Amino acid sequence: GPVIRVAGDSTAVGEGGRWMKEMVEAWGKKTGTRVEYIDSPADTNDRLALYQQYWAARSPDVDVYMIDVIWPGIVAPHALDLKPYLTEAELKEFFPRIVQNNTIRGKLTSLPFFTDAGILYYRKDLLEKYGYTSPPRTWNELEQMAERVMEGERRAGNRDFWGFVFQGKPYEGLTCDALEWIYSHGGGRIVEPDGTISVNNGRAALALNRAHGWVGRIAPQGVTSYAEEEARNVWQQGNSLFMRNWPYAYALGQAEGSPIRGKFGVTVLPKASADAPNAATLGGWQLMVSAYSRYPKEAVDLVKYLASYEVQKDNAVRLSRLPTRPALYTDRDVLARNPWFRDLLPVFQNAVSAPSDVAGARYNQVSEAIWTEVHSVLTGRKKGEQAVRDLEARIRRILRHHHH
């Protein structure tokens, strides 16, 4: 029979690739269909370029792709419209904001699979040891706590110990961290939903200068090369007070044999002041049937299975990744495993999207501009003031003649 081939997630990031292969194999066994899993690189922007080689070729060699929340406007021509395959009631079982993100000129490009939000991981054992009773609410507090805990852990012999790790590599992840920095200082959304390029302002500049001030001080010098997993591995070994990352890291830190099992919590990221908005970048992944698949019926069946209640449940319970179905947020087993899903639900509801809707098919290019200018601040090459001016000019060139 047909072989249904899937590219989605990466064995280089946590358990997501191993789990995705396992779910696809489970569907193949359940339906009696042959399946193959094709692995992907870690970083989302590398995966986009890989998948684009298949799409440019109209290649039938991959039937199902796991696509980023930032991709529908880019990838729509390469997606099979799923709208005729789902009833209205089936579609209403997902969060409507995500179904809307995935719908481009009326084409339902992809089913919501899991959502994502940037959060603050913190070592609660260490906060207690150093006399703090809550995690930091402001970035100034985060800095003060990091400096104090670092001084003590270094003095006690831990040469590897840092205050804060995050994603400072030049790739999409840095755009996500930087949107949080800027938005949490009252600096805006970089490009607003209405199209205004707003980034050249003093609050955004401050945000970026502040992040530079961490590098080599409370965060490792090498943080300018860290993606999700580089940060996570410093954290997970017990060597960081704080980490910014996504929900997937929680299950991994609780695993048997994790040095930090039972020693951490999560909360909203800090902000510049009490009247700034909370910032959590909205992420997440979707399930797309290739417009070039020779087997659309089977591929749609696999996509509906992966997006189903029990597979999203398994993703929540085993991998601590956030469902796209509201009903799972009231499931007793989901909540007992991950009580913080309830505690942070409003952080997840208020998450701020990167500017993929307004940049549309040009989002790749806009984000590359953001991460490169932000990286130039983190490296010390430019100050935030210069970087936000140069970034404004670059985004202006990229989006000239683009209407939304």
Ligand X SMILES: OC[C@H]1O[C@@](CO)(O[C@H]2O[C@H](CO)[C@@H](O)[C@H](O)[C@H]2O)[C@@H](O)[C@@H]1O
What are the residues binding ligand X (CB under 6 A)? 9-10, 13, 16, 44, 68-70, 116, 172-173, 176, 228, 246, 248, 283-285, 321
The first and second tokens of residue 225, run together, are 């090369």
Nearest CB to ligand X, comparing residues 126 and 269: 269
Q: Please report how close the Cβ of residue 262 comes to ligand X at its closest, in angstroms.
A: 22
Q: Please report how close the Cβ of residue 279 comes to ligand X at its closest, in angstroms.
A: 15
Q: Please report how close the Cβ of residue 153 comes to ligand X at its closest, in angstroms.
A: 27
Q: How far apart (Å, rounded) are the C-alpha atoms in residues 124 and 108? A: 43
Q: How far apart (Å, rounded) are the C-alpha atoms in residues 293 and 289? A: 7
Where do we find the tokens 């955004």? Answer: 204
Q: How far apart (Å, rounded) are the C-alpha atoms in residues 245 and 223? A: 13
Contact between 275 and 147 under an 8 Å Cβ cutoff? The reply is no
Q: Is 284 helix (H, G, I), strand (E, B) or coil?
A: strand
Q: Please report how close the Cβ of residue 54 comes to ligand X at its closest, in angstroms.
A: 17
Q: Please report how close the Cβ of residue 104 comes to ligand X at its closest, in angstroms.
A: 17
Nearest CB to ligand X, comparing residues 191 and 206: 191
Among 17, 400, 51, residue whose Cα is nearest residue 197: 400
Nearest CB to ligand X, comparing residues 13 and 99: 13
The first and second tokens of residue 6, run together, are 């899937």
Contact between 29 and 35 under an 8 Å Cβ cutoff? The reply is no
Nearest CB to ligand X, comparing residues 321 and 375: 321
Angle formed by the axes of helices 202-214 and 139-155, nearest 10°? 10
Q: Please report how close the Cβ of residue 125 comes to ligand X at its closest, in angstroms.
A: 25
Q: Please report how close the Cβ of residue 228 comes to ligand X at its closest, in angstroms.
A: 4
Contact between 6 and 35 under an 8 Å Cβ cutoff? The reply is yes
Q: How far apart (Å, rounded) are the C-alpha atoms in residues 85 and 305? A: 13
The first and second tokens of residue 2, run together, are 């047909």
Q: Please report how close the Cβ of residue 178 comes to ligand X at its closest, in angstroms.
A: 11
Determine phi and psi for 263, rounding to 5 degrees.
-110, 5
Element (H, E) at 164: strand 162-165
Antiparallel, parallel or unpaired: β 352-353 and 281-289: parallel
Nearest CB to ligand X, comparing residues 230 and 331: 230
DSSP secondary structure code for residue 82 in this structure:
-
Q: Please report how close the Cβ of residue 360 comes to ligand X at its closest, in angstroms.
A: 16
DSSP secondary structure code for residue 323 in this structure:
E
Nearest CB to ligand X, comparing residues 116 and 143: 116
Nearest CB to ligand X, comparing residues 186 and 283: 283
Nearest CB to ligand X, comparing residues 62 and 176: 176
Q: How far apart (Å, rounded) are the C-alpha atoms in residues 298 and 263? A: 44
Q: Please report how close the Cβ of residue 88 comes to ligand X at its closest, in angstroms.
A: 27
Q: How far apart (Å, rounded) are the C-alpha atoms in residues 241 and 162? A: 7
Using Cβ positions, the residue closest to ligand X within the complex turns out to be 283
Q: How far apart (Å, rounded) are the C-alpha atoms in residues 188 and 200? A: 10
Nearest CB to ligand X, comparing residues 69 and 316: 69
Nearest CB to ligand X, comparing residues 116 and 373: 116
128 exposed, middle or buried (CB, 10 Å; 0-12, 13-18, 19+)?
Answer: exposed
Ramachandran assignment for 378, one of left (phi > 0), alpha (psi -120 to 50 degrees), beta (any other): alpha
